[PDB]
Amino acid sequence: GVQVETISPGDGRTFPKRGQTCVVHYTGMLEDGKKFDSSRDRNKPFKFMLGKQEVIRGWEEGVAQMSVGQRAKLTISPDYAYGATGHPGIIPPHATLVFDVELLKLE
């Protein structure tokens, strides 16, 4: 599942609601410490609407608990994540995912 640990606090009052676009920066690492993704390298925030299922379950639930301005570390088990099939080339099977996610805003 999703484990959320606050790196930096947010406002604590605003939380994503269904049908609301979440704009984030993230850096993606495997539990061994290897980085496979970062929106900051592309310099473009990643936008996803909650409840569509664009992102994996781990992102859905973890960002649901986050707040504006909040930076958090999200640990997502394979079940939430791509799982046994994995993401070919990028992610091996049965890989736990660690994400450093900053929720810049909601729109």
Binding site: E5, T6, I7, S8, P9, R71
Partner: protein, 48 residues
């Protein structure tokens, strides 16, 4: 190694870190904004 402190956050402006060294134990301890940091380094080499 994660350590537990009240109001955990990555070092941010207006934050004061207090570092304490006791060569006798030997131990190194930290306080965050006057609040104890629940972790210590100990049993480390004293070669220098």
């Amino acid at each position: 190694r994660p350590v537990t402190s009240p109001g955990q956050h990555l070092l941010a402006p207006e934050d004061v870190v207090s570092c304490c060294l006791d060569l006798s134990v030997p131990s190194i301890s930290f306080r965050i904004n006057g609040c104890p940091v629940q972790g210590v380094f100990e049993a480390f080499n004293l070669d220098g």
